[PDB]
Design a protein around this ligand. Structure first.
Ligand SMILES: Nc1ncnc2c1ncn2[C@@H]1O[C@H](COP(=O)(O)OP(=O)(O)OP(=O)(O)O)C[C@H]1O
Ligand SMILES: O=c1ccn([C@@H]2O[C@H](COP(=O)(O)O)[C@@H](O)[C@H]2O)c(=O)[nH]1
Ligand SMILES: [Ca+2]
Ligand SMILES: [Ca+2]
Lengths: 445, 288
RNA sequence: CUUCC
RNA sequence: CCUUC
């Protein structure tokens, strides 16, 4: 029947006694893949080649094969697994390449002072050029795909201060899973390079397409459409950026990561730019009260070290007095469950946690290590991130924050480069490193 | 007539606030695979709302036929989520599960060596355990135990991060010995046997700190009593305030479960989302 | 396991 | 075969 037909028209041969039963399932997937014009594709990667990859060592008849060459392995692949594997990927091209990729081809300096200043208060511490081409694609992307891809990180600030030295166009997108598969092929084709796409068990919803030699091409974070909305999004240049305010809160939350302080005692200027480009945004946007004078900041944080859980007194700001900042996600989760709460607000890889307010109290998990100024003494640069974190929530929920943030900022203006006594050992996140080998035909998560 | 106004269904067992003496005198189609579709859509949904479910491997032991499971699979796939689905069961699985690259189908039965194997195999991917192990008419406490005994082993072995374990206290009058089951919230199941005391033991793990709760017959009485109350008095009530097409307690209950489920597609009110899910769900098993 | 915006 | 349903 019409079924066996499709399997041979696809297998470029007769299906074995078994092969039938297996693929039998992959109906239209396999059928569609076939009665799908390859040519048009062959020319679309071409039409792209010259635009973001004009500078490549490839030819029209050379590339053309690759494309076909791939849609031709059904006939040589005899491993039901590898077979199933190449079919799921051929299908990604088939339905999304057009929609997701093909479409493509159709004042501040002021705070430079404060930047250095707030930065200093702290300071107490101790990649293949395809990067380029891609960084050229991504630009158009954010433009085309406003609502299915939002950006941040280094890049973004350069869109508010073209005087910002960035390296990676960082993003959050509702389809990252596809987005990378596609691009993967894009590069795998035009380049002729055998890339790899991996998921890093550590980061939540994270897949970075690296290079044939581990040359970080570009990484991405996936987020529910749900979350995609609540994110403080901003418009400028027909692309959405993560509202710089928010982006500055993580800024603060980042620096509670010792690791990143052994990074501060390095590029004191690197951050010195992104920094003020932010202090500048808000100050101008929400007229941030910038006078060293600032009360009720860095709420008294109490780190029970036996439970590996902090205790912040947001009181002077939000209905809830305490905010139990957990340091063992897997714990918070169970206890949360114990709280019989099943509607905790999760904002995926954004806040890197799920905030909860059972009985007028806030429970949360801090994705970083905690800084100590002394034994049991929570170094201040901690109450820095600790706060922000909360605020992030406040922001993804739209609540009385402006006040606190402005307040928080002022507390950063010129301060003791306080010694760092110790720091917490961030909970290990489990999971095997999964990857996709377009080339070796291996899919694993 | 036999109605009621509630604030929320009894989600977990610790929440039933009354008892009733079990009296042995003791409603859909394809409802079996439904009771499950929810408890599972629910369990994993949380694991996702808390992250755990991220790129992890769900090891479903006691799955088959497991028709529903497909649904679940399609749900999360459609959600961008990444998960390997390992279904092990001596009996076979609803063919609608073959050909799935994201699903492995073991046609074997579990024991000591076996877990030690798959564990080694799967490691270090984080594991999510879903046991629905069985053993006609209704399992004798003799079996109930051996099963639970076995479930407590999977746990210790596959050392999972979270687990949804079958859990129905062994009838008092038929009690044998005590035992421990892992700590964890116990969710009541919607569209479940008129008078069942089954409930999934949802439990998330600490790491090097496993926890079990000693089970006693006194404990067992509480169940029959409380549970029976639920099945006879609670479920058979009508939530007159609940603004939903169907108003039976269960539909009300089923609501509160889905309310927490995730779904990208944009939706107006929640009733909007839930309702759709429900629809789509019943759709799948094919129930009017 | 290491592999971490 | 220039964005494949
Ligand atoms: N601990 C954290 N938790 C959640 N998000 C974080 C954390 N630390 C940093 N981030 C986010 O990562 C974003 C950018 O990563 P990063 O590369 O380190 O700085 P950048 O501005 O992108 O400069 P470059 O990308 O190195 O050129 C900025 C911040 O919102
Ligand atoms: O989804 C999979 C899993 C494994 N393999 C590869 O196929 C070979 C035999 O695996 P089997 O199929 O499990 C190995 O190279 C393995 O890495 C695939 O092609 N696809
Ligand atoms: Ca970055
Ligand atoms: Ca990055």
């Amino acid at each position: 029947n019409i079924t066996l037909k499709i399997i041979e028209t696809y297998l470029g041969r007769v299906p074995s006694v078994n092969e039938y039963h297996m693929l039998k399932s992959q109906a239209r997937n396999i059928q569609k893949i076939t009665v799908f014009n390859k040519d048009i594709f062959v020319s679309l990667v071409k039409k792209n080649k010259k635009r973001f990859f004009s500078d490549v060592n490839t030819s029209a008849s050379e590339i053309k094969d690759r494309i076909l060459s791939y849609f031709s392995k059904q006939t040589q692949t005899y491993n039901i697994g590898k077979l199933f594997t190449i079919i799921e990927l051929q299908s990604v091209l088939v339905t999304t390449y057009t929609d997701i990729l093909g479409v493509l081809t159709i004042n501040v300096t002021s705070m430079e002072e404060l930047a250095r200043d707030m930065l200093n208060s702290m300071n107490v511490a101790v990649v293949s050029s395809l990067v380029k081409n891609v960084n050229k694609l991504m630009e158009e992307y954010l433009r085309r795909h406003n609502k299915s891809c939002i950006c941040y990180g280094s890049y973004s600030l350069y869109l508010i201060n073209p005087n910002i030295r960035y390296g990676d166009i960082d993003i959050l997108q509702t389809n990252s899973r596809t987005f990378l598969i596609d691009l993967a092929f894009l590069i795998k084709f035009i380049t002729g390079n055998n890339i790899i796409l991996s998921k890093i068990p550590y980061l939540r919803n994270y897949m970075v397409i690296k290079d044939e030699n581990d040359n970080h091409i570009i990484d991405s974070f996936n987020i529910r459409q749900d979350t995609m909305n609540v994110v403080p999004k901003i418009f400028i240049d027909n692309i959405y950026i993560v509202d710089p305010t928010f982006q500055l809160l993580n800024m603060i939350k980042m620096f509670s990561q010792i690791d990143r302080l052994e990074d501060l005692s390095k590029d004191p200027e690197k951050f010195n730019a992104r920094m003020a480009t932010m202090l500048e945004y808000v100050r101008y946007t929400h007229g941030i009260v910038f006078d060293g004078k600032r009360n009720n900041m860095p709420m008294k944080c109490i780190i029970d070290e036996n439970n590996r859980i902090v205790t912040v007194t947001t009181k002077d700001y939000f209905s809830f007095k305490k905010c139990l900042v957990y340091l063992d996600e897997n714990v918070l989760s169970s206890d949360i469950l114990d709280l019989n709460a099943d509607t905790s607000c999760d904002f995926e890889s954004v806040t890197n946690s799920v905030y909860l307010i059972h009985d007028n109290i806030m429970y949360t998990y801090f994705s970083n290590t905690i800084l100590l100024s002394d034994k049991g003494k929570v170094h201040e640069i901690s109450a820095r991130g600790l706060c922000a974190h909360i605020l992030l929530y406040q922001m993804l929920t739209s609540g009385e924050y402006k006040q606190c943030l402005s307040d928080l900022l002022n507390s950063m203006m010129n301060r003791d480069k306080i010694p760092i006594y110790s720091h917490t050992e961030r909970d290990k996140k489990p999971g095997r490193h999964g990857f996709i080998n377009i080339e070796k035909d291996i899919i694993v998560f | 007539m036999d109605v009621v106004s509630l604030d929320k269904p009894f989600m977990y067992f610790e929440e039933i606030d009354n008892e009733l003496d079990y009296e042995p005198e003791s409603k859909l189609p394809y409802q079996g695979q439904l009771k499950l579709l929810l408890g599972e859509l629910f369990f994993l949904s949380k694991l996702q709302r808390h992250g755990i479910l991220d790129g992890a491997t769900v090891v479903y032991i006691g799955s088959a036929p497991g028709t529903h499971i497909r649904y679940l699979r399609d749900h999360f796939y459609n959600l961008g989520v990444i998960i390997k689905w390992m279904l092990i069961d001596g009996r076979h699985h609803d063919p609608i599960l073959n050909g799935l690259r994201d699903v492995t189908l073991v046609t074997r039965f579990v024991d000591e060596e076996y877990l030690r194997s798959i564990k080694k195999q799967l490691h270090p991917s984080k594991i999510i355990l879903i046991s629905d192990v069985a053993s006609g008419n209704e399992p004798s406490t003799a079996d109930l135990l051996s099963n639970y005994a076995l479930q407590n082993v999977m746990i210790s072995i596959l050392n999972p991060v979270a687990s949804s374990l079958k859990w129905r206290c062994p009838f008092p009058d038929q009690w044998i010995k005590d035992f421990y089951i892992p700590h964890g919230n116990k969710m009541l199941q919607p569209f479940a046997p008129s008078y069942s005391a089954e409930m999934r033991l949802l439990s998330i793990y600490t790491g090097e700190n496993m926890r079990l709760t000693r089970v006693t017959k006194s404990d067992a009485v509480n169940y029959e009593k409380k549970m029976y109350y639920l099945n006879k008095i609670v479920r058979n009530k009508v939530v007159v305030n609940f603004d939903y097409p169907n108003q039976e307690y269960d539909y009300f209950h089923m609501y509160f479960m889905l309310r927490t489920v995730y779904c990208n597609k944009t939706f107006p009110t929640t009733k909007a989302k839930v309702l759709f899910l429900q629809q789509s769900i019943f759709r799948f098993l094919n129930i009017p």
